[PDB]
Amino acid sequence: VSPSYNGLGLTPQMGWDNWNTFACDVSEQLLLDTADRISDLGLKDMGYKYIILDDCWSSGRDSDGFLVADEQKFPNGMGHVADHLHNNSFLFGMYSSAGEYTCAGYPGSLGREEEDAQFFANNRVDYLKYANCYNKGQFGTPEISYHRYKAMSDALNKTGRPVFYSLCNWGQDLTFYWGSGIANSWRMSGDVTAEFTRPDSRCPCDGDEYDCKYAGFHCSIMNILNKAAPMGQNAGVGGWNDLDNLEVGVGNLTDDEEKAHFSMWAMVKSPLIIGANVNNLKASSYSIYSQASVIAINQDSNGIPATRVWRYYVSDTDEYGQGEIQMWSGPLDNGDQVVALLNGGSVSRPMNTTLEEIFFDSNLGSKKLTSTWDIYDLWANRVDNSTASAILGRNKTATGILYNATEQSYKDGLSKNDTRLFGQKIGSLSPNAILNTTVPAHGIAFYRLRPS
Amino acid sequence: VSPSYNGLGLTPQMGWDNWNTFACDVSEQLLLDTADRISDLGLKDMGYKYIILDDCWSSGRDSDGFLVADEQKFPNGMGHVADHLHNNSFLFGMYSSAGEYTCAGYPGSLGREEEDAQFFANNRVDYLKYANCYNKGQFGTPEISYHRYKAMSDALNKTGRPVFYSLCNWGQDLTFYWGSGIANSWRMSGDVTAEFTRPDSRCPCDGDEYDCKYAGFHCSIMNILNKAAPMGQNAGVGGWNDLDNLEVGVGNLTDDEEKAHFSMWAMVKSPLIIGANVNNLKASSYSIYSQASVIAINQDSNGIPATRVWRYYVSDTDEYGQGEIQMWSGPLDNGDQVVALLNGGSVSRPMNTTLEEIFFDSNLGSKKLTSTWDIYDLWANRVDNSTASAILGRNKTATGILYNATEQSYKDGLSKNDTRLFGQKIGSLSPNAILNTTVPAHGIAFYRLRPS
Amino acid sequence: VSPSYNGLGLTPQMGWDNWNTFACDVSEQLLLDTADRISDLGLKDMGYKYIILDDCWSSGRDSDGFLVADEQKFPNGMGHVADHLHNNSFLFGMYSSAGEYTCAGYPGSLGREEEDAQFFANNRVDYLKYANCYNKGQFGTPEISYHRYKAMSDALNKTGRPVFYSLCNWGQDLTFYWGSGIANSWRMSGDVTAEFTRPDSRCPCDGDEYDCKYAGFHCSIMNILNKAAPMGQNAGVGGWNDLDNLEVGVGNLTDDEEKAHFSMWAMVKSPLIIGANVNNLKASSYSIYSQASVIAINQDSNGIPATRVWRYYVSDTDEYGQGEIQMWSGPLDNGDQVVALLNGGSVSRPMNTTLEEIFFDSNLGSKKLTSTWDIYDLWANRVDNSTASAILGRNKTATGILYNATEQSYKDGLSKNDTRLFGQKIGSLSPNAILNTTVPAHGIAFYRLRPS
Amino acid sequence: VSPSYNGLGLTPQMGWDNWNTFACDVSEQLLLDTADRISDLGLKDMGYKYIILDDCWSSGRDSDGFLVADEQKFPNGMGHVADHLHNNSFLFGMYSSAGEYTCAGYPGSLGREEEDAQFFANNRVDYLKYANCYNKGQFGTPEISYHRYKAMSDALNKTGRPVFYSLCNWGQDLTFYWGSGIANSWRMSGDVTAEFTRPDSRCPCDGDEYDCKYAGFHCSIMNILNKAAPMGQNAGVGGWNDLDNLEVGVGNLTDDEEKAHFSMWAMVKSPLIIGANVNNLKASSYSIYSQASVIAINQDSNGIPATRVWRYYVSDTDEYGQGEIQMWSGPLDNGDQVVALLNGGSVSRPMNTTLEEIFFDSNLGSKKLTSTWDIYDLWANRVDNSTASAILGRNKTATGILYNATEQSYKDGLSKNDTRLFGQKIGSLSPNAILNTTVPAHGIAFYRLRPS
Numbered sequence A, B, C, D: 001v002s003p004s005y006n007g008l009g010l011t012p013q014m015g016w017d018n019w020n021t022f023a024c025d026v027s028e029q030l031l032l033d034t035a036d037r038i039s040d041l042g043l044k045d046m047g048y049k050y051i052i053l054d055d056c057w058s059s060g061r062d063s064d065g066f067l068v069a070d071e072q073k074f075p076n077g078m079g080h081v082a083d084h085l086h087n088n089s090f091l092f093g094m095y096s097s098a099g100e101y102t103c104a105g106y107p108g109s110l111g112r113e114e115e116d117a118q119f120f121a122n123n124r125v126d127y128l129k130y131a132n133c134y135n136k137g138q139f140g141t142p143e144i145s146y147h148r149y150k151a152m153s154d155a156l157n158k159t160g161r162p163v164f165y166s167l168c169n170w171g172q173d174l175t176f177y178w179g180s181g182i183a184n185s186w187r188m189s190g191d192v193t194a195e196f197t198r199p200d201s202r203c204p205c206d207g208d209e210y211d212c213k214y215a216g217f218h219c220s221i222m223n224i225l226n227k228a229a230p231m232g233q234n235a236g237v238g239g240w241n242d243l244d245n246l247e248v249g250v251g252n253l254t255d256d257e258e259k260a261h262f263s264m265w266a267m268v269k270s271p272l273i274i275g276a277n278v279n280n281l282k283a284s285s286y287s288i289y290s291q292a293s294v295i296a297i298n299q300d301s302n303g304i305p306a307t308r309v310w311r312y313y314v315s316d317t318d319e320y321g322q323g324e325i326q327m328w329s330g331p332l333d334n335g336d337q338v339v340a341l342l343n344g345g346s347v348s349r350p351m352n353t354t355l356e357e358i359f360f361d362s363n364l365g366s367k368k369l370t371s372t373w374d375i376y377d378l379w380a381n382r383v384d385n386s387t388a389s390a391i392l393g394r395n396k397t398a399t400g401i402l403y404n405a406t407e408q409s410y411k412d413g414l415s416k417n418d419t420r421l422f423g424q425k426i427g428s429l430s431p432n433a434i435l436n437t438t439v440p441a442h443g444i445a446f447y448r449l450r451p452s
């Protein structure tokens, strides 16, 4: 633990990014309509405050060296978009790269940090995603990468405007070590894709290679989670490990895969950023994004990422030869404990654990191991497929259905003991007893344990 | 994507180099005769414009510190060779090393970049191959290697002469990351040899070791292709991965090995540089170099290297214990798709793929997966062994037989739909159907798919 | 061998640290009571001189930039604690980090080395544990880490006060190479835990990965010993490999595990620092800490760490799939030899060795291989469970029971031949004969061999 | 190839070092007696010119900062020893470390390069072995190690005295790349030991790990040879890979192991430095050192290290689980070829090769593959055990028995075709025929092939 370097990111950020679906194809209308839609679906009031505009937004640089927004896509300027967003209680996020160009080939900020930082402040920006493309060889050791990213960190501070600073260097040069003191969140891997396990030649580093020299992209959900496992210890209040935007609602993942993906991202205190097209979001995906129970885990005050307790490879492998089972446990602020039984195998299986395994750093005969604990299924009481369809199809309102965090912070709700945030009690676990369930293929059992 | 740093290399370079056969043994006559021969065989007009003179060309340095060409080998100077080449519509390329000496022990350019750059400009040079021998410990991190190669990059720019800058550092210190902003192409491995699979003690890094600390040489064709697989994502217009000169016509590769080698080099957008002795070139090798269909893939406008979709090891291993099968797919500018089924096994085998595998980043129900595609064998209509022999034996002319890119750029030919550039339609692939062929040992099936 | 850079640490340091049990929860009273208790139990006079106060002791920094001790925990200041300790013949140790903050988030010493060094001298400090948290990207190569730690090394020297300088960078950037010239001891791994073999996701580097890029913590006893194995050759008089505080009396290790852990730590010349709560220490653990025989090995004059002679994996694996057997041998100053037969297997087993294996660098027919050697069980004559309980329960005094090193240095005792420091002779080993024993699961046979 | 940076080391150096047997225990008498003995046994006139004094020779530094020789060991100074050596036609070599201290703890030369260099010149030194102990963190990248060793390289040059500069950094930071331009030879691994295959915990890097981060020591003969295999390509006239002093006559290697060890060291163009006590040298070891045939390979003009053609692991493993077979081939200056069939297996076995395998870089139908070659056993006509005993026991003189290179350089002898230097013709190898022999366990078949 250390204080937030800039007072922001006391919990992981939440919001939305246009990349995963719209890529370069962007506009003022797309952004604002989507913003409205996110607000209308009640996701904004769940915490999804950040509207993040990605790459391909500028047209070039003007006479003063300052950045110029592509007026075809943005005919009123950027600050105009910020204002619309602020008026609807959103926060506004923009994109750049710590290099000559951005990953799509547009002007980059390397050596031009102050001008660009000021441009973002001038256009009333709250959040900067800062990439790693075309960095002119300014990487390869922790020090050199640290200074390149400190440049913009300092540049933003100089503008006097509070800006949530999001590093996007894919974990290059061991970012988990040096991120906290200059940033609020750092990407720790190459880009995620809508694949749960699939290895990819574009993502050469496997799950064990947290110190990757070619981060790449099209990395699977399990590849990134596996890379993040040891990094939890270097995350905390004010500085988080970023496992990339959520793929829930994107591509062709199963409901089980989407739950597992969303739960784990929340349990390791990763930024929860919607990658889906909210105007073309399916019901099952929508109810996953809106699971207040799980969001509460991610938004835990004085957040601590969960720890992977064990991992075994299984003979039940998928079409890609992948198959492993995992257990994760983690402390919660109010004395509770998160537990995940993760079945990455190709077949439905029984999974089990004990109190000894759950409270991994507790000695024999200690309170936690000698007490009885109530088990809450965090996935219970999820918005059903019919209700979600109705809300998405504008027939119903989200009001009264989805938990409102604007009305009542997650911390408050936990203090008040909202069944809304704790899921449903399905039983209890006692010393010398075993917790057992059936966990679907590529699925999860996700519990919150409370003392009896 | 980013713009070409110097406006050159909008497609991968094509041409010829004396090293693979003649090594140090060089002369004005060898160069000029070969140039004429390349022109006469019609290869020049296919795109093979660059005549690259390699090592062992200088005799020392003169009183002014400037380089001096070995007058026994070059009695008229270098600019005299340039002129002959320009007159015959060739472009002229020379060699140096970012070190104290060249790999053969001749004067090197380290710390003497401006003088040497100017010398090349003064002798009207269009292309520089810039090696990595005797670099005085100026390597080991990306930064230090970047600055060493930037030195000459800057030095060439200062001369005001357009020069195609070809890096030859064998991928040391992760060149794929930093090459684009200062160069047009970069060697990404140690030297190739006329072996398809053979591991070599002089090339200690295997196919998976793209981050190699001892690049070495005598690396097999499959060793280099395997190293290049993840690097595709860091190549594009103006900056290419260089998998070293072609070994087609050199050594004792089979026809199938030569086709596979040539196709893959083209599909990953590698420089296509003839390493063969064109005055002693055999028929089968000649027809491979002259396959307009395959060159069109390499010379695709807005070029994107193909992606390796899958790779499996097989029990059919050769004399060296090597045996793997690969599938590669890649987007083409006009909406087409390149597909390669690569049999690196020791035995002829059936190979298969689907549309789902071919369009690897396409969601279910999307156009590409729901449409029907016509399959074109890119190796059809190749110059036969009799015709090629006749052309090489001067009995026939290449004119009217080989596609003339000078007369009609590859892009135009693709727009005009020249059967010359598309191969022969052998069928079509529909959703839920499987594409199946028989692929020879160490051979390839190489397709272009067009929408129906 | 090289002289001690500062004249201290001629043998490995011994003492106690509050972290392993009390963590942040500390006070003047806790420290002083514990000090008294350590003295009363006779451990002080065995060599456990250093009372090391860990993290969470400061409240902030004062107006002059100097450090300020948290007056709630320390209402008389630090020098007041030093004095009480000096008066009772203890030495006083404090904590800081070569970073912006300490690992618990309190003021760190990076860039503020002189002020902080002076503060420690002013408060009459004898020992500094200097951590690696929040180091602002000042790591990644040996050189950069070396200078960061040299900064404080120099800063302490400037104060003119003798200070035992203990590095705590977890072996990052190959500390064993550069530690000796600027420090007395260096942590060579991430934090130990009360687990003998258990792999942990928070400690990603296994036993073979001595060059670890994410040191982590919760590393098992065998994980750290395995990492230390090759490092012996870079330790000696004045500069030692530090395998972290002893876990004897902490958590739930078996008696056999505690003996193995304690013996090995001693045999490799690691600092012997009590991590146990001495006010809640159990009998068996107490008798282990008080084994004069084993301490004599650690405190050997002109100390040389032992060498691991062999290591095999066995099918007798524990609940964590871990199971290996090891033999270690090491020269002693008086011509004797330490031998350890280490059974990390899950089952009791016979273990054997010869003189050829014991004297691993001795040629055939040399004196050591041709002589006969007496075998001394170093674990014989250990304080029994009844006597220790009595001493801990204040019924008996340690005086007359525990060896007094203050009264008679270990070297003297070895010269005088105290059966107290040599254990019990259990037999002899002759050329061509085999030394065989039964070694318990997770246990050790620990011998001193003397010439007949 | 590149010229020798200083004109020395046109062939690998030959001589003797006191370390392998006498370690720190040294004197003027030991050195001079040994020198006389080496001369009397006729080894000096075989090329063993360099008498290298190792560590533990100085007593401290004098008032001027200059080095002071330990007058108990050297009561006449060092130049006095040089003179005795020059008078007997020897060359004199001394030791230092690019660090604060030497490996035994005596004054080191880091930051004091000029004074020390001048001290060596003043005492008429011809050769410097320059170690890597206590280097104050000045390693970790190629550049930093390069400059540290360039310091002394420059310092020696400044003295104007020709000095053979021998690097001893154990291959740290890829020395094979940067050694040539500043040195004559570089250690490429940790210290050798009298073990043929034995893995050792003090030498953690295996045979494949040429890029070692903890070089260590007590590395086996096969461990070092395996590390050196890829490095041949970076050695040549003026700059050689050093595989450490010869262990022939030291410890308890078999005659077959000693032959294999000596042959391979010669074939890869390593320095041939006697590590044995020449006053206690056994017959079989003596005849190995004196095999003119094999020395001629090492001392080949325009020397090129041999290439390992293939390597397979065998089921015939020794007590340490080690067992591999190797074939090495290499070009010789006069057009001949060295061939080694190396049996690292535990059992005697038949080994075979063809001309295609021997001439690994020759195409089918080329002269070398189509010609017939005469096979010469390089180990034939070796001094027998009786004659060697007599010479060592002073009964006979070496004169007329051992080849005299002082009288006739190896190059001359090869030109004159001395059966003395070629071994005995045992047959011939023709195209499509197989060369087969029986090779002993841990033994070698070592051939020179000549065209018929």
Ligand SMILES: OC[C@H]1O[C@H](OC[C@H]2O[C@H](O[C@]3(CO)O[C@H](CO)[C@@H](O)[C@@H]3O)[C@H](O)[C@@H](O)[C@@H]2O)[C@H](O)[C@@H](O)[C@H]1O
Pocket: A019, A054, A055, A102, A103, A104, A131, A133, A168, A190, A191, A216, A217, B001, B233, B234, B236
């Ligand atoms: O472009 C915005 C992108 O930046 C970050 O990217 C990492 C990724 O960038 C490139 O990927 C893409 C494919 O999505 O490839 C082309 C450029 O050739 C671009 O259209 C696009 O960015 C590189 O090709 C990859 O090497 C690199 O891994 C960021 O992580 C993304 O979220 C996104 O914001």
Ligand SMILES: OC[C@H]1O[C@H](OC[C@H]2O[C@H](O[C@]3(CO)O[C@H](CO)[C@@H](O)[C@@H]3O)[C@H](O)[C@@H](O)[C@@H]2O)[C@H](O)[C@@H](O)[C@H]1O
Pocket: B019, B054, B055, B102, B103, B104, B131, B133, B168, B190, B191, B216, B217, D001, D233, D234
């Ligand atoms: O010399 C021209 C050569 O430079 C580059 O070199 C890498 C390669 O150089 C040396 O190998 C040599 C140089 O003459 O190449 C032949 C092999 O056919 C050998 O006779 C000789 O050793 C170094 O010795 C090697 O370590 C190194 O791998 C460039 O990459 C080549 O394309 C070529 O232009």
Ligand SMILES: OC[C@H]1O[C@H](OC[C@H]2O[C@H](O[C@]3(CO)O[C@H](CO)[C@@H](O)[C@@H]3O)[C@H](O)[C@@H](O)[C@@H]2O)[C@H](O)[C@@H](O)[C@H]1O
Pocket: C001, C233, C234, C236, D019, D054, D055, D102, D103, D104, D131, D133, D168, D190, D191, D216, D217
């Ligand atoms: O001492 C001369 C030695 O220097 C080089 O060795 C590296 C090696 O040195 C140390 O080994 C020895 C044992 O031989 O250990 C003691 C004290 O530690 C010394 O007397 C002696 O040098 C280190 O312990 C090792 O870690 C280190 O690797 C050189 O390589 C040798 O050839 C020789 O010249």
Ligand SMILES: OC[C@H]1O[C@H](OC[C@H]2O[C@H](O[C@]3(CO)O[C@H](CO)[C@@H](O)[C@@H]3O)[C@H](O)[C@@H](O)[C@@H]2O)[C@H](O)[C@@H](O)[C@H]1O
Pocket: A001, A233, A234, C019, C054, C055, C102, C103, C104, C131, C133, C168, C190, C191, C215, C216, C217
């Ligand atoms: O706080 C003093 C501590 O510093 C060293 O620890 C390394 C260890 O620090 C961090 O862990 C901490 C502190 O131990 O433990 C909890 C749980 O994470 C946090 O409050 C705090 O950050 C890092 O998280 C770990 O990655 C790192 O390994 C030292 O080694 C200890 O002996 C102790 O003095």
Ligand SMILES: *[C@H]1O[C@H](CO)[C@@H](O)[C@H](O[C@@H]2O[C@H](CO)[C@@H](O)[C@H](O)[C@H]2NC(C)=O)[C@H]1NC(C)=O
Pocket: A249, A250, A251, A252, A280, B363, B364, B365
């Ligand atoms: C994944 O593939 C499924 C087929 O199993 C397909 O249904 C999804 O595409 C969506 O189909 C919907 C038809 O009910 C359509 O209304 C929706 O717009 C479409 N989504 C997109 C992005 O084209 C596929 N899912 C996704 C997210 O692509």
Ligand SMILES: *[C@H]1O[C@H](CO)[C@@H](O)[C@H](O[C@@H]2O[C@H](CO)[C@@H](O)[C@H](O)[C@H]2NC(C)=O)[C@H]1NC(C)=O
Pocket: C363, C364, C365, C366, D249, D250, D251, D252, D280, D282
């Ligand atoms: C290795 O062990 C052999 C027995 O296998 C032994 O003979 C060697 O010792 C040497 O023996 C010589 C007579 O054969 C004797 O003259 C010599 O003094 C002796 N060397 C030493 C150091 O004692 C052993 N060889 C070595 C080199 O130690």
Ligand SMILES: *[C@@H]1O[C@H](CO)[C@@H](O)[C@H](O)[C@H]1NC(C)=O
Pocket: A005, A006, A007, A156, A157, A158, A159, A160, A161, A162, A163
């Ligand atoms: C600027 O930096 C200081 C810390 O030096 C911090 O307290 C402050 O909040 C930062 N301000 C902004 C606007 O980022």
Ligand SMILES: *[C@@H]1O[C@H](CO)[C@@H](O)[C@H](O)[C@H]1NC(C)=O
Pocket: C255, C282, C284, C285, C385
């Ligand atoms: C003393 O107690 C320990 C338990 O901590 C036990 O394991 C050990 O065997 C006892 N000692 C003896 C000699 O039995």
Ligand SMILES: *[C@@H]1O[C@H](CO)[C@@H](O)[C@H](O)[C@H]1NC(C)=O
Pocket: D254, D255, D256, D284, D385
């Ligand atoms: C010479 O003696 C050695 C003993 O070490 C033995 O290996 C070898 O076989 C002997 N030579 C002959 C020719 O018998």
